[PDB]
Amino acid sequence: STNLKDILADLIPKEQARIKTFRQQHGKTVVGQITVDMMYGGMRGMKGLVYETSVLDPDEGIRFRGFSIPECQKLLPKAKGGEEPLPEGLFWLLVTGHIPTEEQVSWLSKEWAKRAALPSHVVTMLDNFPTNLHPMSQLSAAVTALNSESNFARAYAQGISRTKYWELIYEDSMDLIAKLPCVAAKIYRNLYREGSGIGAIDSNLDWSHNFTNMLGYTDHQFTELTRLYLTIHSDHEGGNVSAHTSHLVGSALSDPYLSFAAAMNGLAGPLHGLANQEVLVWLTQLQKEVGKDVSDEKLRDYIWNTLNSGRVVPGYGHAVLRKTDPRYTCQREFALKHLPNDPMFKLVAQLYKIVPNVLLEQGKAKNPWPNVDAHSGVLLQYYGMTEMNYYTVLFGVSRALGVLAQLIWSRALGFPLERPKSMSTEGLMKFVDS
C-alpha cells in the first residue's frame, strides 16, 4: 500500500526464486577471464560482484533500476513547487524497482522526518571535534559511533535467523538515512557557523528541504539543487570504492552504520570523492592564470600545455564511463537555466566544448569526456557553499541512498562473505610457470 517494508517483503521471495533458478541453470557459466594485468590493475575490467540497484553502462552512463537519469527527472515525484526529483523517490525506486507515486514519496518524507534523531554521545563527540579534523573524518567517526543504535547488531547478538537479517538492515538503513542530514549539518554548523543551532525538522517538508534548512540556506533554488544533487550522486553500480566498501564490509554482517562509515573512509580518498574540490581549485587557478575572460584559442592553448607538462585535466576521464557522464549533463542543464551568466560556470562550459576534442588527439584518455565532478563544485559555490572541504559530505549523504538500498537486498538475498583469493608477485610468477 504505502508501507515500503511490506512492498519489499513481497518482492524478496520472487527475487530469491529468480536467482535460485538462474544459478541452477547458469551458475557454472564463465562470464570473464582474469589476467595478471587485471590483478595488478585493481580488478579493472573484472566482473566481480552482483549489485542490483544500479548498473553503469560504459557508453550511456548510470541506470537506476533500468531508468536513466532523464527518465527519473520526468517520472520521479517532485516537491509541489518543484522541478527536480526528490531523493525519497529515488530511494524507493532502488528498493522496489518501481517508480513511486506521490503518496508513497509523501509517506517516505514523513517516515524519514520522524526517524531523524541523534543521541547525546554523538552530538557531544561532534561538538568536541577540533576544527582541523576534516568533515569526512567527523562524518565517518560519527556514523561509527551511531552503531550503538543498531537494531541489526543487537538482534544478531541475541541470535536470529539468516532469513530475517533484511528486516533489521531495513530499519537501521532507514534510521541512518534519516539521521545523516542531522550529522552532516551539525558538522557544517560546527565548522563554518561557529556552532549555531542546527535547528528543527519540519515533519511535512521533504528530506532535502529539512537538510538545506538545517545547513542555514533558504533559496528554494538551492533546495532544488540539493534535490537533484542528492538524487544523482545516489548510486553508481557496485564497483566504485564507496559502494564496494559498503558491500564488502556488509557481507561480514557488520551493521549499516559500520558499513556506511567504512564506505565514507573510501569516499574520503582523493581518487574517489575529493575530485569535485580538485576541479574547483584547478578552475580557480586557471581563471587567475589566463584572466576571467579567455577566448577558445587561448583556452585550447592552456589545455595543450597542461597536457605537455604530463598533467591531466581534472573532472575528465573515468574508470568505466566511456562517454559524457549523464550526471554532468543534468548539472549543466540546471546551470544554463538557472545561472547561465556565472563567471565560473562559463569556464566550465567553455572547457566542455574544447577539452573533449583535445585528449582525443592526445590519445591517452579512453574517456575524453567530463564526469560529474567537473561541474558540481561551481554550482555549490554559486549558491554560497564556499567551504570546499565539506563538499564530499554532500556526496556521502547522497551515496547512503544507493549503498543502503543494496545492503538491504544483499542481506535479503543471502549474499555471502566477500572473500576473493590473493596472490603475491613471487607466487604469481610460480603459478604462471606451472
Q: Which residues are annotated as a binding site for oxaloacetate?
A: 327, 399, 419
Would you call 296 a catalytic residue per the annotation? no
Q: Of the residues 272, 301, 338, 342, which is catalytic? A: 272
Quick note: the x/- pattern for a copy of itself over 4-23, rule CB under 8 A, is -----------x--xx-xxx
24 binds a copy of itself (CB under 8 A): yes
Positions 385 through 414 that interact with a copy of itself (CB under 8 A): none
Residue type, 346: K
Q: How far apart are CA 363 and CA 354, in angstroms?
A: 15
Interacting span for a copy of itself (CB under 8 A) from 54-62, 87-95, 101-109, 167-175 = 54-62
Positions 246 through 285 that interact with a copy of itself (CB under 8 A): 248-254, 258-259, 261-262, 265-272, 274, 281
Using DSSP's 3-state secondary structure scheme, residue 419 falls into coil
Q: Interior CA angle at 349 toward 348 and 352, to 5°? A: 95
Among residues 292 and 429, whose Cβ is nearest to a copy of itself? 429
Interacting span for a copy of itself (CB under 8 A) from 88-96, 174-182, 235-243, 289-297 = 235-243
Q: How far apart are CA 9 and CA 144, in angstroms?
A: 28
Is residue 175 within 8 A of residue 5, CB to CB? The reply is no
Smallest distance, a copy of itself to C-beta of residue 181, A: 17
Interacting span for a copy of itself (CB under 8 A) from 105-113, 180-188, 321-329, 390-398 = 321-329
288 binds a copy of itself (CB under 8 A): no
Residue-level length of the chain: 434
- Which residue positions form the known binding site? 327, 399, 419
Smallest distance, a copy of itself to C-beta of residue 294, A: 19
Cell of 114: 520522524
366 binds a copy of itself (CB under 8 A): no
Is residue 175 within 8 A of residue 118, CB to CB? The reply is no
98 binds a copy of itself (CB under 8 A): no
Would you call 375 a catalytic residue per the annotation? no
Would you call 272 a catalytic residue per the annotation? yes
Q: How far apart are CA 105 and CA 206, in angstroms?
A: 9
DSSP H or E stretch at residue 68:
strand 67-68
Number of residues that bind a copy of itself (CB under 8 A): 150
Out of 14, 28, 291, 297, point to the residue binding a copy of itself (CB under 8 A): 28
Q: How far apart are CA 215 and CA 134, in angstroms?
A: 17
* DSSP result, 224-268: HHHHHHHHHTS--TTTSHHHHHHHHHHTTT--HHHHHHHHHHHHT
Is residue 396 within 8 A of residue 273, CB to CB? The reply is yes
Active-site residues, by number, are 272, 318, 373
